[PDB]
Design a protein around this ligand. Structure first.
Ligand SMILES: NC(=O)c1ccc[n+]([C@@H]2O[C@H](COP(=O)([O-])OP(=O)(O)OC[C@H]3O[C@@H](n4cnc5c(N)ncnc54)[C@H](OP(=O)(O)O)[C@@H]3O)[C@@H](O)[C@H]2O)c1
Ligand SMILES: O=C(O)Cc1nn(Cc2nc3cc(Cl)ccc3s2)c(=O)c2nccnc12
Length: 315
C-alpha cells in the first residue's frame, strides 16, 4: 500500500516529508524537490516558523500542474499557546493563510499540554517550568471538531497523546469526530508497541516522527544514541544494499505506520523515497523491534509537572 485509510474515509500517504528545522532558506526547494520525486504528504506546524516558505512551494507546484491539490495530503498542528477554545480557529486560519491553502487534510493538536496565550511559543517561570493554560483536552477537542464542521480541515487528530489521553477523547459525551491520527515519536529505540497496538485497535492511524532519531535535534552530542550509526542497523542495510536511512524509513512502513522523515538535502529527499521496492524480512523486523530502549528525543522536559504531561504513563 502507498496509503492508509482514515476514519473520515480519506487515504493518507504512508510516506511524508517532515519540515521541523527546515530553515526558510532551504525549505521551499525541499518541498519542491519532494513533490517532484513523488512525496504526496507534507508535515508542517506553525511552531516550525516556516509555513510561508512551504506554502510558496506547494502553490508553485499546483500552479505548474505538477500535482493536483486533491493528490496532496497537507498536515499542520495547533500550537500549545492556542488551546483556549476561542483561539483555535484563528490559529488554524493563520496556518492556512501562511500555507496558501483553502483547507488542511489533517490538523493535529501538537501536544496535550496547553500553555498560556501570548507572543512566546514557550512562556516560562523562574523554575524552568512552562506557564500552563487553564484549558482541558476535551474543550480543545470540541474546538477542533468545529474546524471540520466549518470546512477548514478534512480531519483532526492528536500528537504526543498517551493512551489514557486518547481514551478521554474517545469516551467524551457527545463526541462528533474521533481522532484520525496520533502522531508520536517512533523508531527502533522507542518502538511504542503498546500505544501502537492501542491506537490501531481503535482505528486511529499512527504517524511515526523522528524515524531517523532526529540527529539534528538541538545540542545532540556524538556520544548519544545514533540510529543512523548503529552498526547493527548498518548491517541490515548492507545486506539489502540500501542505506541506513532507507531501512529506518521502511521499518515503520512494515508496521502499518505512516512515517515522516525530514530532509532539506535534495539527494537525501530523493534517496529516502526509494523505500517502496524492497522489504525487510521477518527476522529484520523482529531484530529492529528488539532494539527498543525507551529513548525519547522529544520528552517535553520543561512540562513534566503539567497536568496533561503525556510521558509519565507507561503508554
Ligand atoms: N509531533 C511532534 O511533536 C513532532 C516531533 C518531532 C518531529 N515531528 C515531525 O517529524 C519530522 C521528522 O522528525 P525529525 O525532523 O525530528 O527527525 P528525522 O526525520 O528522524 O531526522 C532528520 C535528520 O536526518 C537527516 N537526514 C535525512 N535523511 C538522511 C539520510 N538519508 N542520511 C542521513 N541523514 C539524513 C536530516 O538532515 P538534512 O535535513 O540536513 O538532510 C535531519 O538532520 C519532523 O521534521 C516533523 O515534521 C513531529
Ligand atoms: O516537537 C516538534 O514538533 C519538533 C522539534 N522541535 N524542537 C524544538 C523545541 N522543542 C522544545 C521543547 C521544549 Cl519542552 C522547550 C523548548 C523547545 S524548542 C526540538 O528541539 C526537536 N528535537 C527533536 C525532534 N523534534 C524537535
Amino acid at each position: 500500500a502507498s496509503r492508509l485509510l482514515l476514519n473520515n474515509g480519506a487515504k493518507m500517504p504512508i510516506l511524508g516529508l517532515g519540515t521541523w528545522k527546515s530553515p526558510p532558506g532551504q525549505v521551499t526547494e525541499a518541498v519542491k524537490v519532494a513533490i517532484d520525486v513523488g512525496y504526496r504528504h507534507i508535515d508542517c506546524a506553525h511552531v516550525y516558523q516556516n509555513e510561508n516558505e512551504v506554502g510558496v512551494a506547494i502553490q508553485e507546484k499546483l500552479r505548474e500542474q505538477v500535482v493536483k491539490r486533491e493528490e496532496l495530503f497537507i498536515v499542520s498542528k495547533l500550537w500549545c499557546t492556542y488551546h483556549e477554545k476561542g483561539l483555535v480557529k484563528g490559529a488554524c486560519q493563520k496556518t492556512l493563510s501562511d500555507l496558501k491553502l483553502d483547507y488542511l487534510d489533517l490538523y493535529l493538536i501538537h501536544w496535550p499540554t496547553g500553555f498560556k496565550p501570548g507572543k512566546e511559543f514557550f512562556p516560562l517561570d523562574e523554575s524552568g517550568n512552562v506557564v500552563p493554560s487553564d484549558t482541558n483536552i476535551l474543550d480543545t477537542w470540541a474546538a477542533m471538531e468545529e474546524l471540520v464542521d466549518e470546512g477548514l480541515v478534512k480531519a483532526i487528530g492528536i500528537s504526543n497523546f498517551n493512551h489514557l489521553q486518547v481514551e478521554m477523547i474517545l469516551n467524551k459525551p457527545g463526541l462528533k469526530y474521533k481522532p484520525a491520527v496520533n502522531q508520536i515519536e517512533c523508531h527502533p529505540y522507542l518502538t511504542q508497541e503498546k500505544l501502537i497496538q492501542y491506537c490501531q485497535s481503535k482505528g486511529i492511524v499512527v504517524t511515526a516522527y523522528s524515524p531517523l532519531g532526529s540527529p539534528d535535534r538541538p545540542w545532540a552530542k556524538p556520544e548519544d544514541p545514533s540510529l543512523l550509526e548503529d552498526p547493527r542497523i548498518k548491517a541490515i542495510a548492507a545486506k539489502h544494499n540500501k542505506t541506513t536511512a532507507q531501512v529506518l524509513i521502511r521499518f515503520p512502513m512494515q508496521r502499518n505506520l505512516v512515517v515522516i522523515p525530514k530532509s532539506v538535502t535534495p539527494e537525501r529527499i530523493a534517496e529516502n523515497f526509494k523505500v517502496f521496492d524492497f522489504e525487510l524480512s521477518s527476522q529484520d523486523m523482529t531484530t529492529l523491534l528488539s532494539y527498543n530502549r525507551n529513548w525519547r528525543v522529544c520528552a517535553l522536559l520543561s512540562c513534566t509537572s503539567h497536568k496533561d504531561y503525556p510521558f509519565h504513563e507507561e503508554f
